[PDB]
Amino acid sequence: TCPFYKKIPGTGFTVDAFQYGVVEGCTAYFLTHFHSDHYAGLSKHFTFPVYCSEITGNLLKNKLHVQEQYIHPLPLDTECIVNGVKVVLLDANHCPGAVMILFYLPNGTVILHTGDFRADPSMERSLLADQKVHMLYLDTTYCSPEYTFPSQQEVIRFAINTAFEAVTLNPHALVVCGTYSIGKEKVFLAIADVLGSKVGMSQEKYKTLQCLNIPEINSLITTDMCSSLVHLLPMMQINFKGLQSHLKKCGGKYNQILAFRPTGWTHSNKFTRIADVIPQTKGNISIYGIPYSEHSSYLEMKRFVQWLKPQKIIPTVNVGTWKSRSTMEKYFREWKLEAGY
Ligand code: NI
């Protein structure tokens, strides 16, 4: 049955709650973003109203084949009414079309659901600043002080300079970027832009990108692999074996590969700076691991919560074990004692 952390009290709404069949009492199902864990259970067979961003709607329509009559896309940064209740969608700074949702309940309580997010100081001057938020449903993916990472911009600058140098040294080198869902698109778009190339990819992946309201997209991506010097492949293929094999398939148009595996955190964030990063190499193929995160670091999450000053926090990630919940409660108390709410 549908957990309490996916229900919004005093409404018949739920959030990211598609895997439990019909939820008794639920008149509207919100979807924060198009990642499979969150959409799990949605298909052409779903027949209740789904509320979401425009981008998330395009993906539902085109990739999942949800019937149009059930898709209710809402604009960002706009006060809207849904079944008698005032809501607002905000940019979550996660993957394309991902939202936070603000619910203004009839009793005067205000609730923020972050979905998945990467907290940023620009969220401190949104519509959130205009009133007290009483309850917060929080993306707690990285809620522990060991989780540090560079900014998105530091990582992109590194990727840019690396790719430019390698291809000016060897103009018959190919650049590859691994991917498994939407998100982290700036990695490959910024590499392509500095090399004066379009990004080549499979038909399924091109169909996905075409839904994302990216401006001038037709000038940036193609399905013609041969015409392009940056290619996208599944993350699973980003290894020496998979990369040699792909290199054979391109018809001796390239004699070297430089590949990037964007990841979350792994243990080497705890010593290394982005500037110290060196690849793994076997022969004419080099692989770089780059920590491009679309979740809040511990410090970004803590700052956001200390600013917001919620009366109650409801975690949405790592809630499956008592040890994690207990650990998270401990950090919420510290934050509250330091900041005085
Ligand atoms: Ni996500």
User: Could you tell me the residue ranges of all domains in the chain?
Assistant: 1-147+296-341, 148-295
Residues whose CB is less than 8 angstroms from the CB of residue 298 and which lie 6 or more positions away in sequence, other chains included:
142, 143, 144, 145, 146, 147, 148
- 185 alpha carbon to ligand 1 midpoint, in Å? 14
- 94 alpha carbon to ligand 1 midpoint, in Å? 7
Cα distances from 208 to residues 60, 155, 174, 217, in angstroms, run 11, 24, 23, 12
Six token digits for residue 208: 């996905």
Give yes or no for a contact between 82 and 129, defined as CB atoms under 8 angstroms apart: no
Give yes or no for a contact between 32 and 95, defined as CB atoms under 8 angstroms apart: no
Please tell me the distance from the alpha carbon of residue 11 to that of residue 33, in angstroms, as a whole number: 21
Is beta strand 256-263 parallel, antiparallel or unpaired with respect to 230-234?
unpaired
Six token digits for residue 329: 């409660």
For the chain, helix (H) and strand (E) counts, in that order, are: 8, 18
- 226 alpha carbon to ligand 1 midpoint, in Å? 32
Tell me which residue of 312, 301, 316, 304 sits closest to 14, measured CA to CA: 316
Residues with CB under 5 A from ligand 1 (ion): 35, 116
Six token digits for residue 83: 């079944």
- 135 alpha carbon to ligand 1 midpoint, in Å? 21
Phi, psi (deg, nearest 5) at residue 88:
-140, 135
Please tell me the distance from the alpha carbon of residue 149 to that of residue 141, in angstroms, as a whole number: 13
H or E stretch at 200:
strand 199-200
Place of tokens 């869902």: 181
Place of tokens 């409660």: 329
- 116 alpha carbon to ligand 1 midpoint, in Å? 5
CATH topology agreement for domains 1-147+296-341 and 148-295: no
Six token digits for residue 119: 């907290």
Please tell me the distance from the alpha carbon of residue 305 to that of residue 313, in angstroms, as a whole number: 9
Please tell me the distance from the alpha carbon of residue 318 to that of residue 327, in angstroms, as a whole number: 10
Query: 1-147+296-341: which CATH number, 3.60.15.10, 3.40.190.10, 3.30.70.20, 3.40.50.1820?
Result: 3.60.15.10
Resolution (A): 2.0
Beta-bridge partner residues of 258:
175, 286
Tell me which residue of 100, 97, 13, 99 sits closest to 62, measured CA to CA: 97
Tell me which residue of 301, 248, 253 sits closest to 123, measured CA to CA: 301
- 265 alpha carbon to ligand 1 midpoint, in Å? 15
Asked if the 148-295 domain carries CATH number 3.40.50.12650, the reply is: yes
- 314 alpha carbon to ligand 1 midpoint, in Å? 17
Please tell me the distance from the alpha carbon of residue 17 to that of residue 70, in angstroms, as a whole number: 16
- Cα-only R_g, the chain: 22
Please tell me the distance from the alpha carbon of residue 119 to that of residue 28, in angstroms, as a whole number: 27
